[PDB]
């Protein structure tokens, strides 16, 4: 029955994961106590994808909360929808990871990883037919980055034929916590290239710019950034959660979006970012606009390999089809000509909360190489002088492992440029 097991790891992963569950619970009419109080059976038709059904017809998120310190998960448990989560699905340590990939991946994380897999195993057993896994985390910290990728590796070992999907938050100096973020991100990307089928690249620089320049927020907070991510995650998973014309799961998505195994890093987008309803041409225009992208990459600096678009709300399906075809026909140079009809659109009649209609963008563009280039430069700037390396070598790592991760990411960049000139 296409069940998905959700995992959220670290501070960022849990804070965005919590918001995601708050949003879709509302869309499915699930109250903070886990009771259904909706008005449409369309909300319950595919509820099993993300929710287990309890004893007294209560719905419990198939979610596992992981962290190396109890702080954020104490906040989640005390949050608005904090009581909806299964108490046994809270797996945490006390040491923390100190924004250190090595601690998350090799030392502190290794002590906790088996306990997480136990809960993962238990959730998978309650699935009629496990579709795949979904992970929310950041790449700049220690737990989400280090332990998160360790989890992914452990999961692939036990479930080699299941789809692995991540929403990965990319660090940036503009919204930074520590200077070692490029180290942690580069080490993680190496893991993601090999062990994920689909990765949504969420750039904190893009999230900030959207809040500052577009939403007119002079002082954006993580909460403001997470609002955008929460909305994007809802739209991305729309065809998973709601009945519609589209009969497809995560594997069908991966098959059609990923022409080459390593190139599975997507640029998410959302529109609108007010009481004035948007016309279909406006939704389509904004959706393809760089300012609505969340990877901080200019799509005009590359070419689209594949594009997926999801429109939500009651609108003319003809007008949607016309506008989508319009964009392709007006900008044919930004789409690869060696993949016929590489832009697909799906429509869901059910709009999200607060909007009469909206559009979600999922692009596999070669322009994403700008994100990895940026990280690679910040990495190299420090690594050439071996700056801050002692935090990692003190945890048993050697310089060779950094060189390899750096090499693999630069290879990833070159492979994107290779198909940009095809």
């Amino acid at each position: 029955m296409r069940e998905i097991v959700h995992i959220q790891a670290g501070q960022c992963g849990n804070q965005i994961g919590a918001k995601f569950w708050e949003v879709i619970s509302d869309e499915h009419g699930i109250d903070p106590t886990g009771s259904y109080h909706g008005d449409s059976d369309l909300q319950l038709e595919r509820i099993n994808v993300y929710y287990n059904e309890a004893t007294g017809n209560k719905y419990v998120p198939r979610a596992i909360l992981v962290d190396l310190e109890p702080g954020t998960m104490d906040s989640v448990r005390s949050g608005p929808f904090g009581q909806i989560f299964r108490p046994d699905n809270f797996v945490f340590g006390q040491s923390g990871a100190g924004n250190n990939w090595a601690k998350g991946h090799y030392t502190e994380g290794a002590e906790l990883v088996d306990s997480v897999l136990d809960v993962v195993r238990k959730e998978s057993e309650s699935c009629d037919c496990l579709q795949g896994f979904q992970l929310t985390h950041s790449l700049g910290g220690g737990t989400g980055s280090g332990m998160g990728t360790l989890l992914i590796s452990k999961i692939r070992e036990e479930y080699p034929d299941r789809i692995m999907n991540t929403f990965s938050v990319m660090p940036s100096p503009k919204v930074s916590d520590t200077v070692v973020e490029p180290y942690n991100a580069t080490l993680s990307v190496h893991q993601l290239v090999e062990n994920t089928d689909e990765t949504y690249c969420i750039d904190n620089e893009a999230l900030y710019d959207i809040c500052f320049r577009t939403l007119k927020l002079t002082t954006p907070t993580y909460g403001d950034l997470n609002h955008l991510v929460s909305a994007t995650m809802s739209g991305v998973t729309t065809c998973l959660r709601f009945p519609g014309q589209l009969n497809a799961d995560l594997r069908k998505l991966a098959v059609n979006m990923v022409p080459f195994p390593r190139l599975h890093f997507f640029m998410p987008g959302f529109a609108p970012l007010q009481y004035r309803a948007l016309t279909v041409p406006e939704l389509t225009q904004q959706m393809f606009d760089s300012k609505n992208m969340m990877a901080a990459c200019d799509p005009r600096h590359g070419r689209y390999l594949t594009v997926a678009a999801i429109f939500r709300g009651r609108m003319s399906m003809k007008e949607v089809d016309e506008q989508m075809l319009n964009v392709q026909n007006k900008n044919s140079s930004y789409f690869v000509e060696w993949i016929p009809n590489n832009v697909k659109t799906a429509v869901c009649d059910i709009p999200p909360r607060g909007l009469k209609m909206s559009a979600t963008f999922i692009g596999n563009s070669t322009a994403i190489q700008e994100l990895f280039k940026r990280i690679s430069e910040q990495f190299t700037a420090m690594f050439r002088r071996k700056a801050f390396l002692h935090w990692y070598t003190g945890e048993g790592m050697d310089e060779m492992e950094f060189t390899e991760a750096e090499s693999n990411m630069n290879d990833l960049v070159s492979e994107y440029q290779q198909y940009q000139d095809a």
């Binding site: 075809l325 319009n326 026909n329 007006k330 044919s332 140079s333």
Partner: protein, 319 residues
């Protein structure tokens, strides 16, 4: 913003057409293998008509009629005229022709052979010399209209545009490709009026510039020398022949109810005898134009053949 592709770099006519499209700011040229186009300036050979009109949200137009090769090939034209009831063997404006393979009309040609001068193509009074050379064998017009002074031969080229609605437009400006050498009914330079031949084997450009006489001069000549006009003595027959050929093949090539649309520029070649009778020589599917007529004609193509389908933000005679 309309989009188009170019798949024939050797096209003189459509190199100017694409230039004009870009000079409107409403047309954009795409890569040759880009399927997301509105207009296609296709290749002369093996044009993939089968891939046209299958792209969603795109009205597609092509500068060639599929099946028009039946009219624009030597042997196909002869076969078409004979086997079509609307043309028949009693065509009257097309010289007696026979298709000969090196079907076929070999015995029938000899039966008519027995002025007995013919010409083979794909000039001799002996049938034995013709066959041993070999294609189509056509009766050579031994009595052509000769321009004076010079006592010289000529042919008439007419440009015809047929749009997507199958309207037949005749360009006002035709051209006479004349011979610069005096005619001799007893050396095939004064017998062949091709521009490439006259610019080589010939006294070239003695009478007119580049052996090209245009309609206004030729009309004035007819009035002075024969007391008649170009319209009456010649153009009436030309317009008739053009209309006969294009209407005959219409139901076979019309894109009226097709998933894609077609238009095409044609080059009709005529011969005029001393009785002021017009004979059709052949039809060109990919013709070139006169140098001084490129500007006007190509703009005419954009106006009635292209913009009629894709409107932006007469030099033709409708037949």
């Amino acid at each position: 913003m309309y989009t188009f592709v170019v798949r024939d770099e050797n096209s003189s006519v459509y190199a100017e057409v694409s230039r004009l499209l870009l000079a409107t700011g409403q047309w954009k040229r795409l890569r040759k293998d880009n399927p997301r186009f509105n207009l296609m300036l296709g290749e002369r050979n093996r044009l993939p008509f089968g891939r046209l009109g299958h792209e969603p949200g795109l009205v597609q137009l092509v500068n060639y009629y599929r099946g028009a090769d039946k009219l624009c090939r030597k042997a196909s034209l002869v076969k078409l005229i004979k086997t079509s009831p609307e043309l028949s063997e009693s065509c009257t404006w097309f010289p007696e022709s026979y298709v000969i393979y090196p079907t076929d009309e070999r015995e029938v040609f000899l039966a008519a052979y027995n002025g007995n001068v013919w010409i083979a193509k794909s000039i001799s009074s002996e049938a034995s010399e013709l066959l041993d050379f070999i294609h189509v064998i056509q009766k050579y017009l031994e009595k052509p209209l000769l321009l004076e002074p010079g006592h010289r031969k000529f042919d008439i080229r007419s440009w015809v545009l047929v749009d997507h609605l199958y309207n037949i437009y005749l360009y006002r400006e035709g051209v006479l490709r004349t011979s610069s050498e005096p005619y001799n009914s007893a050396d095939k330079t004064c017998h062949l009026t091709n521009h490439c031949i006259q610019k080589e084997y010939s006294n070239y450009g003695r009478y007119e510039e580049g052996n090209e006489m245009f309609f206004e001069e030729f009309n004035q000549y007819l009035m002075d020398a024969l007391n008649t006009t170009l319209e009456n003595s010649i153009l009436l027959q030309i317009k008739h022949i053009i209309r006969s050929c294009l209407m005959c093949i219409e139901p076979a090539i019309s894109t009226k109810h097709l998933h894609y649309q077609s238009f095409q520029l044609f080059g009709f070649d005529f011969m005029v005898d001393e009785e002021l009778k017009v004979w059709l020589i052949e039809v060109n599917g990919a013709p070139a134009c006169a140098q001084k007529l490129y500007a006007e004609l190509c703009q005419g193509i954009v106006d009635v053949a292209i913009s009629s389908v894709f409107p932006l933000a007469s030099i033709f005679i409708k037949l």
